[PDB]
Design a binder for this molecule. Structure first.
Ligand SMILES: COC(=O)N(CC(=O)O)Cc1cccc(OCc2nc(-c3ccc(Cl)cc3)oc2C)c1
Ligand SMILES: COC(=O)N(CC(=O)O)Cc1cccc(OCc2nc(-c3ccc(Cl)cc3)oc2C)c1
Lengths: 264, 271
C-alpha cells in the first residue's frame, strides 16, 4: 500500500461533495423514479403549469414568460456557484493556494462544473428544478421563442451523452474536483503546483473509475473528452448569454455571473 | 329551421370519399400507430438504440443483399428511402382516388404529385412519431430520436427537424379523418409551378380546403382556429421540405457511399 494515501483523498472529496451539495445524482435519480418516496415532482409543460409553479415554488409576475425562466435560471446557478466554492475550499490543497489563484480556478471552473452536475438532474424529457420539487420539460424549453430555446437544448445533448457513462456521485465528486483544479486556466500564479495538484486528483480519479467501472477500462479517457466538450459548451454558453443580454430588453444578468464572464 | 341540405351533403360526401381512400391506400395510420406504441395491441415493436440492435434488426426485420457491409449511417439513409418510395406509391394511389384528380391533365397529375409528396410524407410521418422515436418497418420496428441524433454530421441533421415539426403537429391532436383531408389539400395545390390548368386546380383546392374547414369546426369545436393553425403548418412544411431538399443533395454530393434512389432523384430535380 502506497495508494492508501489516495483512497483516503477520494473519500475526503466525496464527503465534501455530499456535504456542500444539496442536489446529487443518487437523490435526483430516486426523485424522478416513480419510486418517488412521498410526493413526486410538479411538472411544467407550459404557461398554466409554469404560473402554478411560480406560485408555489418561488419567491416576476410583471414580466414575459421567457425572461421568468431566464432569471429563474440565474437564481439556481448562483446558489450552485456558492455550493461549488464551499466544495472547492474542502478540496485538500485548494486552501493552500494564493488567494487570487483560489479565485481564478473557480472563475473558469464553475460553469464547466455546473453543466457536468446539471446532467444529474436531467433526463431526455426534462430536468429537476426548484430543489427537486419541480420538473420542466425539454420540449417546453424548446417551444419557447428565440433565442431563449437555444439556451438549454445543447446542455441536454451533453447530459444524455454524459449520463450514458452512468457515473455516480463518487465519480462525479472527483471529476468535478479535476475541473476546478485545472492548470490551463489563464493568469494562474503558481502554475507548477496547481499542475502537481491536478495530476494528483487525476490519478485518484483514474484508479477510482477502474475500481468502480471495471466493465469499461477506458471510461477515464472518455471523461477527459467530456472535459473537452464542456469547455466548448461553456464558450458556446458565454456567447448565447452575451447576445441575450445585448439584445433582449428585459434580460437581466446577475452581477455575480457578470463578473464571472468578465474577460471570459 | 332546416335538416342537412345536399350542397353540404356533397361536402360530407367528399370528406367521406377522401377518408376511405386514405384508409384504403395507407398501410400505416395514426390509429394503428398509437395502439402499436402504447403496447396495447401482440409481440410489440423492436427497439433500435445502438449498433447491436441496428445490426440484429436488419437480420430479423428487412438480411441486406447489397448493403450488408456498408457503414452504419448509410444503411439508415438507404433504409429511409425504401420507406419513402413505398409511401410515394401509396400517395399516388391515394391521389388517383381524390374526386377530380383523375380528371386533370396527365402532366398536372404528376406536377401536383412532384411538389406534394414530401410535404405529405412529413405531415403523415408525425403519426408514427413521438418525442422518443418513430415506428419503422411497417410498425414492427422503433428507432430512438436520441440514436438518430447520436450519429455524425450531417446524417443526424436529417431526422431531427422532422421531430420538431411532428411534436408541434401532433399537439394539434388531429386524427385520420382530418389528416386525410389535409393531405388532399397538400396534393391539390394551385401554387405549384408549371401547372397547366391552374384555374380549375385553384377551384379544386378551394373545395377541399372548404371541406377541411367545416370538418375541423365539427370535430374540433374547442379550437375554432384549428384551420388557420393548419395553414401555418403547410407553410412550415414547405420550408421543412426545402431544407430537406438541400441536406439530401449535400449528403449525395459529399458522402461517397450515399446513393440516392433514382425515383427520388427525379422528384428532387428542380426544388
Ligand atoms: C442564463 O441561464 C442559464 O442558462 N444558466 C444560468 C447561468 O448562465 O448562470 C445555465 C443554467 C445553469 C443551471 C441551471 C439552469 O437552469 C435551471 C432552470 N430553472 C428553471 C425554472 C423556471 C421556473 C421555475 Cl418556477 C423554476 C425553475 O428553468 C431552468 C432552465 C441553467
Ligand atoms: C434521405 O432519407 C430521408 O431522410 N428521407 C427519405 C427521403 O428523402 O425520401 C426522409 C424520410 C421519409 C420518410 C421516412 C423516413 O424515415 C423512415 C426510417 N426508417 C428507418 C429505418 C432504419 C433501419 C431499419 Cl432496420 C428500419 C428502418 O430510419 C428512418 C429514419 C425518412
Amino acid at each position: 500500500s502506497e495508494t492508501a494515501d489516495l483512497k483516503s483523498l477520494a473519500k475526503r472529496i466525496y464527503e465534501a461533495y455530499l456535504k456542500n451539495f444539496n442536489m446529487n445524482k443518487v437523490k435526483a435519480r430516486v426523485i424522478l423514479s416513480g419510486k418517488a418516496s412521498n410526493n413526486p415532482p410538479f411538472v411544467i409543460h407550459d404557461m398554466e403549469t409554469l404560473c402554478m409553479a411560480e406560485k408555489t415554488l418561488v419567491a416576476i409576475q410583471n414580466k414575459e414568460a421567457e425572461v421568468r425562466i431566464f432569471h429563474c435560471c440565474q437564481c439556481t446557478s448562483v446558489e450552485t456557484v456558492t455550493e461549488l466554492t464551499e466544495f472547492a475550499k474542502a478540496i485538500p490543497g485548494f486552501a493552500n493556494l494564493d488567494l487570487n489563484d483560489q479565485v481564478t480556478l473557480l472563475k473558469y471552473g464553475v460553469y464547466e462544473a455546473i453543466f457536468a452536475m446539471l446532467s444529474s438532474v436531467m433526463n431526455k424529457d426534462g430536468m429537476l428544478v426548484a430543489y427537486g420539487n419541480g420538473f420542466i420539460t425539454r420540449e417546453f424549453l424548446k417551444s419557447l421563442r428565440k433565442p431563449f430555446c437555444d439556451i438549454m437544448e445543447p446542455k441536454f445533448d451533453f447530459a444524455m451523452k454524459f449520463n450514458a457513462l452512468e457515473l455516480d456521485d463518487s465519480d462525479i465528486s472527483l471529476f468535478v474536483a479535476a475541473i476546478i483544479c485545472c492548470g490551463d486556466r489563464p493568469g494562474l500564479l503558481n502554475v507548477g503546483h496547481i499542475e502537481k495538484m491536478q495530476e494528483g486528483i487525476v490519478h485518484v480519479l483514474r484508479l477510482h473509475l477502474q475500481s468502480n467501472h471495471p466493465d469499461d477500462i477506458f471510461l477515464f479517457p472518455k471523461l477527459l473528452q467530456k472535459m473537452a466538450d464542456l469547455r466548448q459548451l461553456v464558450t458556446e454558453h458565454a456567447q448565447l448569454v452575451q447576445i441575450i443580454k445585448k439584445t433582449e430588453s428585459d434580460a437581466a444578468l446577475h452581477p455575480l455571473l457578470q463578473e464571472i464572464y468578465r474577460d471570459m
